[PDB]
Design an enzyme around this catalytic site. Sequence first.
Site, PDB file in Angstrom:
ATOM      1  N   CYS A   1       0.838  -1.215  -0.042  1.00 37.54           N
ATOM      2  CA  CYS A   1      -0.026   0.086  -0.050  1.00 37.54           C
ATOM      3  C   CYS A   1       0.907   1.157   0.043  1.00 37.54           C
ATOM      4  O   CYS A   1       2.210   1.296   0.145  1.00 37.54           O
ATOM      5  CB  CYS A   1      -0.944   0.026   1.085  1.00 37.54           C
ATOM      6  N   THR A   2       0.170   2.229  -0.564  1.00 36.05           N
ATOM      7  CA  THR A   2       1.074   3.605  -0.634  1.00 36.05           C
ATOM      8  C   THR A   2      -0.188   4.582  -0.097  1.00 36.05           C
ATOM      9  O   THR A   2      -1.447   4.435  -0.579  1.00 36.05           O
ATOM     10  CB  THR A   2       1.265   3.774  -2.020  1.00 36.05           C
ATOM     11  N   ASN A 183       3.819   0.874   3.115  1.00 37.89           N
ATOM     12  CA  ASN A 183       3.529  -0.257   4.140  1.00 37.89           C
ATOM     13  C   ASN A 183       4.572  -0.927   4.500  1.00 37.89           C
ATOM     14  O   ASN A 183       4.882  -1.376   5.796  1.00 37.89           O
ATOM     15  CB  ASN A 183       2.998  -1.499   3.295  1.00 37.89           C
ATOM     16  N   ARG A 215       8.153   2.884  -4.673  1.00 34.92           N
ATOM     17  CA  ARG A 215       6.841   3.664  -4.798  1.00 34.92           C
ATOM     18  C   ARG A 215       6.974   4.853  -3.993  1.00 34.92           C
ATOM     19  O   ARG A 215       6.480   5.990  -4.241  1.00 34.92           O
ATOM     20  CB  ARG A 215       5.663   2.661  -4.290  1.00 34.92           C
TER      21      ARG A 215
END
Lengths: 347, 347
Positions: A1-2, A183, A215
Amino acid sequence: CTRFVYLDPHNPDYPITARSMDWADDTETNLWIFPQELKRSGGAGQYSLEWTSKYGSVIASAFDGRKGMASTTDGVNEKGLAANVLWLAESEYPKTKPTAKKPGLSVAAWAQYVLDNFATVDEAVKSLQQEKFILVTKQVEGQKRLATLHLSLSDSSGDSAIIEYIDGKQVIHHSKNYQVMTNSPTFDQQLTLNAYWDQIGGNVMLPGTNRAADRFVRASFYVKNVNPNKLIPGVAEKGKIEKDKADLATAFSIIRNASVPYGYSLPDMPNIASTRWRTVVDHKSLQYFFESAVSPNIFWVDLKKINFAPRGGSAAKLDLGPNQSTIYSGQASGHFKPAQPFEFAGL
Amino acid sequence: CTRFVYLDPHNPDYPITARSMDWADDTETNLWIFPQELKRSGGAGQYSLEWTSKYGSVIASAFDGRKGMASTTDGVNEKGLAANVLWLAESEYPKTKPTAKKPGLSVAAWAQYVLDNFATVDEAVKSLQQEKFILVTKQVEGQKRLATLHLSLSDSSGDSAIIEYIDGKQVIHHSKNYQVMTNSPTFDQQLTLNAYWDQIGGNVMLPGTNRAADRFVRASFYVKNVNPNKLIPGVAEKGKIEKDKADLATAFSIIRNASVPYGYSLPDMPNIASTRWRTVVDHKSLQYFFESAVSPNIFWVDLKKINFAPRGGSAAKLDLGPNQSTIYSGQASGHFKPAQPFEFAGL
């Protein structure tokens, strides 16, 4: 996740939070309206934490139809506080057992607890620092294990914070400067990832892979270097509304850029997974956008158009259907239907 | 600015084409249904090429309300041939002036001509090779004097081709292996850009900038290495329809990954610009998807639900409004309204 918070220098007091949810399987996500004054239990042991929600929220659930796994993953409340639970983290939660003086709170309800009780990041940080509860997670059926996670928070003031559990201890980083959070790795490490790339330009090169580090780096660069509301010779400065919309487009494009293509997987790195959906929070307008990456589906929910007054313990649900394929368009608060709050996973 | 054809080994005979349109300003794009048997003129000049459309098409226009600069930029016809006009290319068009047989075809109509007349990439390539016309441009004064493009094509058979003008000469590359195409550099150069990155893994590193080379490399990698329909024995093998949808989601995610964040610009490289929208073509279902990157707007057009029979020279238009903000949801063919075909820019 970002996750990130985007701040446009040419359009101040208009923060926008964006997040991607990355997971290899359907999360069976739906949206929920949770009114004020819901009575809730922490879902931990015989000593579960208890509270009555002060603020109403719109949230995105995962596995809400399964006793074993139901959680709040993401959301915003009526004061503009947003919360995201980032999955595939490297957290180690406390060993210490819940006690009546210090009761347990299930991980599944962690974000909900915050959205229910606090109006700002600062408020929430002050309360979390007091360590009023012990965060717990379950013992679950094999093949594989599960999700560790951490909690990121953001405000209508543009403030940010992240809360992790490292070596069983609660670690909080709180600052308006913490615009980007992934994450993995731990946030202390995240804080040093940009340095090399700042030294050379981000216009010169960026890493392009899906790795959390990449990311983080990409998103950090675009968030600091993209201004869609630059003044241009020969072109009227835009109006407030047009500037707002342009910021929204910028935030969407950056979170899309940090997403992980659907179907991608790398056996060596199981903490990389397909982005399945994205949310974007416009704090000032109190608008919560949801975008499926699996099905064509983008729409938003305007918290100003929702009555968050108590409904005798009931709530409302926007059923997104299998693979979030049930299409809604435009402002969708009207399509929410009454339903009882799902039970949070725990013990 | 980025286009590709995606082919899933686990879901054969189901090609999907995707493209991003990259431009620093509003393109005032709308969608258009063009029925069979429209009589069309090449737009330039004394000796303009003339034809009567054989196949109907759905296309995406640019600046269709301006005599000076209306074009067809993207589209698919009722046989599954898709065409894209990639902007900010480095083409040098012929010097030679149009003569009655060999007459002129304006660049603005170049894709439309192909969509109107041919059913497959092969058919189109065979005809284009005969050099039946001279491609022309060059009508405005402009702030600074340069503009250019090339034409990419794809099929329901998964075939691909690209047509460029280099040193005034028509250059054609035609092969099912040419899955990825960017606006720059020339395609001969594009063909060598992956080699380095194939040598090391794409899972090891990828370049992450908005440079055309980087976008080409990223898209090439994901297109060859992402399978959303891998057997995971575990989760039931999916049905044809679910496999199709997954391929669609994969294609969408890859084109989003290759997009350029909105508001990004680099003075040194004026051929990099904000992605404003994306299209995706599902050739087998004959569905044309459109997605704005400026406004929240995603929907599709099902060519099987449109009657492409002649309408006495009229056509239909889907007005997307300022910044493509006019929202449509789901299958949108019903929202197209009668209108006269816009005039192609030229002389």
